[PDB]
Amino acid sequence: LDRADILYNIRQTSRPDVIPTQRDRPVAVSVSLKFINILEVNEITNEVDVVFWQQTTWSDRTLAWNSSHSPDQVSVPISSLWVPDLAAYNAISKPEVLTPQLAHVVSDGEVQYTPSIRQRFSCDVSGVDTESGATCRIKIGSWTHHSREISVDPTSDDSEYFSQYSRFEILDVTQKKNSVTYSCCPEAYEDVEVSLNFRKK
Amino acid sequence: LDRADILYNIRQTSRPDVIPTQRDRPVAVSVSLKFINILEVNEITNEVDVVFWQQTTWSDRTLAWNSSHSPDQVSVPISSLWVPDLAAYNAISKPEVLTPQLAHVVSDGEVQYTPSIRQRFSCDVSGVDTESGATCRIKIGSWTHHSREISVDPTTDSEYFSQYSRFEILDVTQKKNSVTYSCCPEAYEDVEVSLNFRKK
Amino acid sequence: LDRADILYNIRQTSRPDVIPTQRDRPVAVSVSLKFINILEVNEITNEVDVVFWQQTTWSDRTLAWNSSHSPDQVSVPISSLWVPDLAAYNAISKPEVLTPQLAHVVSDGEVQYTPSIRQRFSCDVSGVDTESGATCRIKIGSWTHHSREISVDPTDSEYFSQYSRFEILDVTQKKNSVTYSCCPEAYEDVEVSLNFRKKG
Amino acid sequence: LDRADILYNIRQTSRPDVIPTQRDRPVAVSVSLKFINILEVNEITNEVDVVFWQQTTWSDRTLAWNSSHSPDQVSVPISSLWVPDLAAYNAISKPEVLTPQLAHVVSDGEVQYTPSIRQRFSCDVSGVDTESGATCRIKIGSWTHHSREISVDPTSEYFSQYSRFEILDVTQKKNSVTYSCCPEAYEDVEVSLNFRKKG
Amino acid sequence: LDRADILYNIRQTSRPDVIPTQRDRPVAVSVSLKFINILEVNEITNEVDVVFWQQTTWSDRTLAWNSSHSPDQVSVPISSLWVPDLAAYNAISKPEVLTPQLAHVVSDGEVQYTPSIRQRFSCDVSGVDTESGATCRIKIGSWTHHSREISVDPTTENSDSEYFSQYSRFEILDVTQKKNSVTYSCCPEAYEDVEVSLNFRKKG
Ligand SMILES: CCOc1cncc(N2CCCNCC2)c1
C-alpha cells in the first residue's frame, strides 16, 4: 500500500454521515483549546474575540489499514470523514476557520483535527483591567448526539502558543466536564467547559 | 438494521423536494423559539439583534423504519431531508446559522431541527430603558405553502438566556395567525412570538 | 399524478438554461415591488437601504401538466427552473436574499417567484426631511436579453413596516425601452418611483 | 437548430478549462470599463470605491454553429465557457459581481461578458477637491497567461447623476511588462480615470 | 498533444488529495512573499493589514508530459491539483484571495501558484512612526505535514519594494527571510516554517 492507495480506499468506503460507534459504546471525543490570541474585549457588553486551536481527537476503525510496509499516516480532507458535531453554546458568531481543512489519520484509525478558529463569545469580562483578571467560560459539546452516542472529555501550559504581542495575558486555563439534561429530551448531553483567566497588560 | 444501513436508505429515497403531505392534510409543523441573547438594541431606528434556538418539529413517514433490533434514532444532514420553508417576516438580515446543520430523526418518522440563529429584526423597541420594558414581536411562517399544505403551531423563558447579556427577559408569549395576502385566495399561517425585555 | 411524480418530471426535463420563448415571442415577465422597510438613508451621499418583495411572474409551458385528478400547484427550487436575469441598474450592492429560494408553479405553466430582498441603491435623496419628501427611482430590467426575447411590464404601504423611521407617500411605475451603445436592439426595463419622507 | 439544441451542444462540448487558441496565436481579448459610480473616496489613505461595467470580448470558434434557420445568439452561464483570467493589479478587495453571470454568444463564436462590478482600489486621490481633479489608474490584465497566449487591447455615458463626484476624462493605454519570475511578457490595459468632487 | 489533450489527462489522473512524495522524500516547497500594500496599522492593538503575492513552487511528476511537439505549459484550476496546506500562524483573519485561482504547470511537472492575498496579522507594530520603523514577522508553514513529508524553504534568488505601491501611507525599509524547524507538544516530528521579517514605517 502506498499513500495513493490508502486515500483512494478512504474516499470510496468512508461514510462521512455515519457515526463510528463500536458496539453501543459512545465515540470518545477529546477536546483541547490552545489559546493563540485575545483581540477585542468589551467590558460594557460582555463580549470577547478569541483565536484558538481546537484540537479534536477520536477513533474510527473504518479508516484503519495494515501499515506493515506502508505509510502509518495520511492527511485527509474533512469532507471525506465523519467528524463530531461540536458547537460553542455561548458563541455569538459562526466559527471562522483560518487553516486548511485537513485531518490527520493514523493507520490504527486515530483521527486528529486541529483547526485554528477566530470566534466571538458572550461571557463574564468584569475585572479585565484588574490584577486578578476576568474569567471567561466557553462551553463546547455535541449539538445533536447524546451521552451514549458521543462523550466529550478534556485532555499543559496555557500561554505555550499565546501571542506575546496581544494586549492581554493569560493567568490560568482550567477545564471541566458537564453532563446536562435539556427540556427537550430525557437523555443527557455532555460538554466541556473551559475557563480562561486573563487580564490587560 | 444498523445506523449505516438506515442513513444509506435515507440518502437514496428521501426526496428533499417533496412535501410529506398525508392524504391532503397539511404537514403540522411546530415552532418554538428559545432566546439565548440580546445583542444590539437601537431605540432610535427600532432594530434588535437576537440569538435564539429555532426548534422546529414535524412528521415525515417516508423516513420511518422498523427498529426491533435497531437504533431508534439517527442524525441526518438537512440537505438529505425535506425541510419546511419558514421565514421571519420582519427580519432585516438573513439568518446566520451558528450550529452544525443536522436534524434528529426518530424511527417513527419524527423530525426535529433546532439550529442556533443570530438575526437582526425590525420591531418596537420603545421603553427598553423602562421598568415595564419593550415588547418586540417576531412573525414566522411558511413562505410558499398555504394553510392546507403547511400549518404552523406554537408548542405546548430565560432558561437558556445568557446571564451576561445587558438585557433581561420579562416574558415570552406565543400566538397563531391566519392571514390572507393580496396575491392569493388561500390563507397563510404564521406564529407571532412576543418578547418582553428591558435593559438591566 | 401526485406531487412526487410532478417534481420528478420537472427535475428531469426542465432545462434551466433555456429561455421558454414561444414562436418567437418575448417571454412576458411582470415585475412588482412591495416595499417592506427603509433602513439607512444618507442625504449627503445619496444612498438608501431598502427591503422589498420582488414579485416576478412569467409563463413556461415546459412545466405544465394535466391537473385532472392531481395537484394544481407545487413549490420548486429555483435551481431547477429557468428564471429571468433581472438586475437593478442603480444598485450599489448585490441583492441579499432573505427568504427560501422557491418558486410557485401552477399546472398551466405559470411561475411566480417572490423573494424578499435587502439592497443598497444610488438615487435622489434630497428633501427626505421635508413635507413633500424625496423621490428615489429604481430601474429594473433584463441584463442580457433584448426586447424580442424578454419584455418587462408593471403589474403602497400595504406591507410597509410601521416601525420604520420613514413613511411612504406614493409609489408609481413606468416602462422604458432603451437602446445602449453596444447593440442595435432595445432593452426593456421598469422604473419604480418611490416617494417617501422622514416621520415627525 | 433551436435554442434548446444549441445550449445542449454547448453544455456537452464546451471545455471551460481550455483556452481557445488558434494555431498558437493569442486569444485577442478586448476590455472596456464603463464607469457607473464613485462611492467612497479617502484622500488620506489613497483608496477609492468604484462601480463599473467590465465589458470583455473575445472569440471562441468551439462555440460556433450554423445560424441558417436558427437563432444567431444565446445567453450562456459563464460556468459553461472558457473565460479570460483577468485581474485588477491594484485592487484591494475582491470583485463584487452585481449582475447575473451570463455571457452573450453569437453563432460565429463571438463572446461578450459584461458584469457590473463594485471594487475598492489603491490609487492617486490627491487633488480630488480641486478644479483639475485626481487621476486614478486601474491596471487590468491576464494573471497566468503571457503575451503569446492572451493579448489584451483597449476598445459619463452611464455615470450616475447622483454621485458626489463627476468624470472629467477617461483614457486607455496598453502595457507589456516583464516580471521577475518569467522571461515572457504579460500584457495589461491601464485605464486612467480623471474625476473630482462636485461644487 | 495539444492543450485540450493535456488538460484532459490532468483532470482524469491528477489526484488532488495525494501528496506527490518521491521515494520517501519531502516535497520541497518554495515560498516567497512579494509585498504590494500595507493598509491598516494599529500600534495600540498590534495589528496590520497586508496585501501580498504568495509565490509558491513545487514539483509534481504525476503532471508531466512529453513536450516534444507540444505546448510546454498550461494553466490549471487549483481544484484539479494537489496543493501544499500552508497557513500563516499569526494570521487573525482567513486569507482573502483577490485573483483567479489558477496554477502554472510546466511539462516537467513544475508547478507555480501565486495568488494575491489580503490578510490581517498580529505582530510587533511599535516604532512604526519612527525613523527606524517597526519589524513585523509572518510565520508560514505546513499545517498537517511534518518535515519528512513537506519542507519549506525561502527562495534562493534575491529581491521588496519591487511591486510595492507608491500610494501606500507606508514604505518598506527591508525584507528578510529565515527558516525554522519547530517541535510541537502534540507530536515527536518537526514541522518546518518560513519566517518573513518586514521592516517598514510611516512616510513623512
Ligand atoms: C430531539 C433532539 O434533537 C435536537 C436537535 N438539534 C439540537 C438539539 N439540542 C438539544 C440537545 C443538546 N444540544 C443543544 C440543541 C436537539
Ligand SMILES: CCOc1cncc(N2CCCNCC2)c1
Ligand atoms: C401562490 C404562491 O406564490 C408565492 C410565491 N412566493 C412568495 C409568496 N408570498 C405570499 C405568501 C406569504 N409569503 C410571502 C410572499 C407567494
Ligand SMILES: CCOc1cncc(N2CCCNCC2)c1
Ligand atoms: C452585446 C450584448 O451582450 C451583453 C452582454 N452583457 C451585458 C450587456 N448589457 C447591455 C444591455 C443592457 N444591460 C446591461 C449590460 C449586453
Ligand SMILES: CCOc1cncc(N2CCCNCC2)c1
Ligand atoms: C510562471 C508564471 O506563473 C505565474 C503564476 N501565477 C501568477 C503569476 N504572475 C506573474 C505574471 C504576471 N501576472 C501577475 C501574476 C505568474
Ligand SMILES: CCOc1cncc(N2CCCNCC2)c1
Ligand atoms: C498529530 C498531528 O496532527 C495534527 C493535525 N492537525 C493540526 C496539527 N497542528 C500541529 C502541528 C503544527 N501545525 C499546527 C497544527 C497537527
Ligand SMILES: *[C@@H]1O[C@H](CO)[C@@H](O)[C@H](O)[C@H]1NC(C)=O
Ligand atoms: C517524444 O516525442 C518524439 C516523437 O514525436 C519521440 O521521438 C520521443 O521519444 C518522445 N519521448 C519520450 C516518450 O520520452
